[PDB]
Symmetry: D2
Subunit: 425 residues, 4 copies
């Protein structure tokens, strides 16, 4: 077939609303390699957007999936239960940070995970409002669009999203927002628009993904934890992207020295299959009356075993450790590039959640959304699949599977090195 | 390895909010048969809630999945596209009622589907309000919970869901709501709370699911269509549960005599794998700006080929036909047991979407909810998995796979027969 | 100094949003008489919209007001208190129906009264939702427009008004809506959009004003009281228009057999001066924290002494008894005019809150809005100021001062008779 | 006839929600003097809260009031028009800054004004959102409470107020908020929660009253003007308190260098009688369909003539000029008392809108609400009525009539001085 031929049909059958980063149709993939319908091979650094921390179709994961496929694919837990769902919950309850009893709900998409986390926080505290941070991303349902700190294009032309969501400033010294500023912004909400007694939860990404890979410091999370504690507000850690080991630990919160009340997870949790969930303080999770929580596909059988296997593979294969190594390699590699390309104004990242911000002529005030896109474009023509993000589209985030070999690591770095040289000429 | 023991583990690991219709754990299934961890075999008349119209792990579908499983399971379409997604959209564009160009978007869940169809309608009309009907069910997200016409237990303790969702009366003579009343109830909204110019769309289930399997007549649907046409209101047909040939036609709207501007689908579409989508008037679908639509697992690769394979199966095994028969057989068998039992006040159903509503002493004023629950429990004792529904939890709805053998149908009616005769001794 | 001339200046300096029922500039008035800038005299049957029950410039009221002008006109009660405010509250605490301790807050307009009654009901119950009825009118502020069961023209073109206000049907048998349907419409909200525990109050007009002068029956009002009681919902009675003894009792609720938790009042309470208030169960009133209620002009000194004087008149001049007699004289006179003209399909009203509803050929489903508007126009030509109301604008309501002359009663009815004759001619 | 006796009666008849700054009952007043029911004479430095810039019962104003009182007090302009209303609008149309044609709507309270200003902006832009500033105050109706940047106590226990109101930062270097930060806070809203095209207006006090008397600079207001121009957003200026000559010019905006699209006025416009309004771009004002703007008491006759006379009094008595002289003297006298007491960390104000902020040990981080509150008590014992304000209740504002005599200005400063000295040991 042909990529362009498939793109033409795409434009005829699918709405333009559905964006398309790379105009390539994949055919097969394996770990870090992807082959398009034209037979061309690529080194995947987007990882399906952090969904493949274990790589494309990890064998142990596929094996489990094939086995379950001989048994059953769906029943809808709420009608007839099944062990995989039960077993995954039990494991999340103990792996998700929190020195106390927890319970886990399994849904299907990261959006639904956040939707439920807030629902549960509201039923628990008996309050309606929530607070979210600038540059945050939490999903594409009406309510999660309101939580998401970005209107364009996610809400464009649709009108105002749900109310009673209040905006706080995410800490980010790189741009003049001090942890004191972030904390102050929360009190501002309490004083100006919504008293604590009306705030059911504060939703935050320990490390923002779509936001441009900006991380919270242990100190700030601790203050946030104290503030929430003082007002009986549930702290929700959206770990949909930062979770499943991307930061060096299974969940980023672990590195914050403090525990959330509720945690959402998805993407890499199932290494390539549709699964999401909420894990939180047991009594909070139970605040909802029976029949209150649910969903048809929720905690799908095949995805459950894949999740279980992903968790096994993480231990058997030492991914958490590799996640740190990989980040250090990419970070050193990228810094070597930064010594001959001032346009790269910052190399940051926790574990393997690495990213670089492109500024025009060094200046930390001139986002280069054009060079960024050029780098992506050039990178693709060289067989490297990259992704960008951040409120000013000048951030390159690397989400390559943790299972990547050193050769592919050097390979990718090299390709990114040229993209810049060939882009200054 | 015991249902009881697993149920106890469940209470310690999973929230009570996730209801449990049957305290049984399924180990494996095949078409209409299901075996638990203990070994007991049941006959599934619930089909994972209208999800398995082609039966559990249908052989042709399973092979397709297995094939795709060797290639890839996820890339995130908006990043790297793939043919199965593109192909299905093309077929749905042709399969969904409406003699005009259409475009399709693939999401993951029925909730996401309705969510996007509303976003789409809003962007297209530049309006924020929506009208849904009493007894409707559209999802467990904040917004789809507002759309759903039932607070308990879906919203209990959570507070009020997003506003700007107005309630209309779903036509239902069996309870005193004439079609005229229904259309009038819509004019009431226009006069009292939200003018037509502020209503983006009117969402409706051609045939309500949890609502009690009540169906709209072509006449009504037609006035509804004319009313929307007059005001530029997008008519949304939520066919998440009525679709996939459950009523005889692939979509219930086909039998209504008019096309909707937007249609949502899920459940049986992929016969047991996580997938959902929205098909609508091309002009409308494109109203959303590029990058405004999308979800991480959207139109999952494996789920897609399963759906493609399910559509082939429908055409090859005449499932649309078997549905109409199966439905007729059920009605008759039930109408029979209704002779000896006045408790069965009504036996209705479109295609294979059949149901019976139990009443206290044949009194259409006293909904016998306790009797309903009684039969459910009794059928399970005799190996039959049934489901109840309706605003008064007094309705029994059959969602048995269309691929059920003639014997299992008698075997089914017999079991239900026993239950009624035994509950009356 | 010409009407037409002043109207041209109007269009030039005042917004057209401010509708002008009669293109006339009143220069002076006295009891039921009004003279325009051209010197023409009119008989006032609108009464400034139920604001002048004691007539234009009642001698006793004006005298009281003049005395107060010599002392002070404003201080802002919450800053420096004054006695007229205090005295009026003590009196309202006794006069407002309800056999138990009460407390009163004084604001300035009817809309503020309703705003404050809901605020109070919310603080007292810890709930946010409210239920109002079809055809209801509660004010022009954002929230009260939401409560008002009429979008056009009040909130026309402004987008949707505040959410979390649900709509119930007002009992109106003339138009096929039984008290059973009305109560039922409330349970429908409880099951479909807002559970009792989220509803702070049910706001209702004992007799709808703008809504068509449709009155509630004691039987209905009673079922409503028990309903609220069962769910701890505050029953708010908006008597801004039905109050001030327009129905035969100081407050219409007195005739219902039950007492509300809160009652709003304005218009006639002060006989032509800016004043309004909320009276209710003491414990409910005190629910709002200190400093939570207030308003610059609230309970203005002149308005208060004016209201104190209005109350004496009602007592000294047997106005309630007069309201009842006046009502009968009017209805009988109207009933006679109807024996000739079939168009008049209804003649109703408690006390002096009288109105007639016109139909096309007496077809009780053909609101003859055109004729209603014509009768108004004709009456104006004959020196009779009238007002139409009702959802379909086919209702003429009489709000002539209770201090009307026997002769003016004959004259009003006569002019009306002429209008229906000269029109049907 | 006893202050305490009346306070006792108040506690039994009126809800505690209604605060009480001074537990004194005024009997009569004249210009800047008030006498309680016990005969004690105080000097009024609060002015009914900026409502009496022409003093208590200004002889000219009263005379005007009495004349109208002989003609008519109410008709409801919507029903029968009258000249005082028309005439006042024409004068307002030309007095309010703006080289374009303007139209004026008259209502009754400042809350109604802001409410109406927003409805008009909404119809004109066909947008629903609004932006307001931190520490702002706009009224006590539901919607105006949401606009108001202060939850406590204005809405405690009540729950969340209407949404789709976003918060921007009011510029205030004295406390860290720069003009750039304020402008940045608005873009932030545009980027995170509500796009410019969904924002109908930006509401702002040229000089925050309740907020603590912080003035906006011309430069800042100009950037705000340009920003609204760029996005078709109506700029609403709330001059309810800053209006009517308090700042040295009739409207504070005159001193800003730009014109708003809409202006709300109240308080001192009528010198002690219930009246408020909205004056704005004519075509904006006319966006509301006829019949969409009303209010029973709206632009009351007596109050209208009072405003017309007040405006005349400002001219013949040179109040604007006196306002500036009064401000200077006060500020000089206060800066004097500020040399013996470091608690007075700031002396500010435009014209006669003067306020002093008290910090602890002159620590611009230690708001001394205790002292501030203590100064008010001592002052009242010395026959002087004062008021406090500010988000931290550490600001003393002076709203004494501009008609104050020179000796009364000394008397006031001497007393205020005597209050700070005595509060030292
Ligand atoms: C932090 C975060 N939260 C929620 C979501 C939404 O999840 P989904 O795309 O699976 O709906 C994403 C998606 N990239 C995310 O990064
Ligand atoms: C009509 C209808 N709409 C939407 C949904 C939500 O779909 P899901 O459970 O897959 O989220 C359902 C599920 N029972 C449904 O029946
Ligand atoms: C029942 C009722 N409530 C509230 C209002 C509003 O009162 P106001 O015009 O004084 O704000 C009216 C009058 N239009 C009314 O009739
Ligand atoms: C800027 C401002 N806006 C609105 C209002 C509300 O005015 P009112 O109390 O007359 O309703 C006030 C008065 N506290 C005010 O100072």
């Amino acid at each position: 077939n042909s990529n362009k031929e498939l793109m033409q049909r795409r434009s005829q059958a699918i709405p333009r609303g559905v964006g398309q980063i790379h105009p390539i149709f994949a055919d097969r993939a394996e770990n870090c390699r992807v082959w398009d319908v034209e037979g061309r091979e690529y080194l995947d650094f987007a990882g399906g957007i952090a969904v493949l921390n274990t790589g494309h179709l990890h064998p142990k994961v596929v094996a489990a999936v094939e086995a379950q496929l001989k048994k059953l694919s769906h029943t809808c837990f709420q009608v007839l239960a099944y062990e995989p769902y039960l077993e995954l919950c039990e494991i999340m309850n103990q792996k998700v940070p929190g020195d106390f009893a927890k319970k886990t709900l399994l849904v299907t998409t990261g959006s639904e995970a956040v939707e439920n986390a807030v629902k549960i926080a509201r039923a628990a505290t008996k309050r309606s409002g929530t607070i979210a941070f600038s540059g945050a991303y939490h999903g594409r349902t009406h309510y999660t669009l309101a939580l998401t700190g970005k209107v364009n294009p996610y809400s464009a032309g649709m009108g105002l999203m749900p109310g009673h969501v209040y905006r706080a400033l995410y800490p980010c010294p790189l741009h003049g927002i001090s942890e004191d500023d972030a904390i102050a912004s929360i009190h501002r909400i309490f004083k100006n628009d919504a008293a604590p007694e009306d705030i059911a939860a504060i939703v935050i990404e320990p490390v923002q993904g779509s936001g441009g890979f900006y991380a919270s410091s242990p100190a700030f999370m601790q203050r946030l934890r104290a503030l929430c504690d003082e007002h009986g507000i549930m702290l929700i850690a959206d770990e949909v992207q930062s979770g499943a080991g991307r930061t060096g630990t299974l969940f980023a919160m672990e590195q914050m020295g403090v525990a959330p009340d509720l945690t959402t997870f998805a993407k890499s949790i199932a290494g390539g299959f549709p699964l999401a969930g909420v894990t939180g303080r047991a009594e909070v999770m139970d605040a909802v009356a029976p029949g209150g929580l649910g969903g048809t596909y929720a905690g799908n059988p095949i995805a459950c075993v894949a999740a279980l296997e992903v968790l096994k593979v993480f231990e058997q294969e030492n991914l958490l450790q590799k996640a740190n190594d990989l980040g250090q390699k990419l970070k050193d590699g990228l810094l070597a590039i930064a010594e001959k390309h001032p346009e790269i104004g910052d190399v940051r990242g926790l574990g393997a959640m690495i990213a670089i911000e492109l500024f025009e002529d060094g200046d930390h005030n001139k986002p280069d959304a054009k060079l960024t896109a050029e780098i992506v474009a050039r990178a693709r023509d060289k067989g490297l699949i990259l992704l960008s993000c951040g409120p000013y589209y000048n951030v390159l985030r690397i989400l390559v599977p943790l299972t990547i070999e050193d050769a592919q690591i050097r390979q990718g770095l090299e390709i990114i090195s040229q993209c810049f040289d060939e882009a200054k000429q």
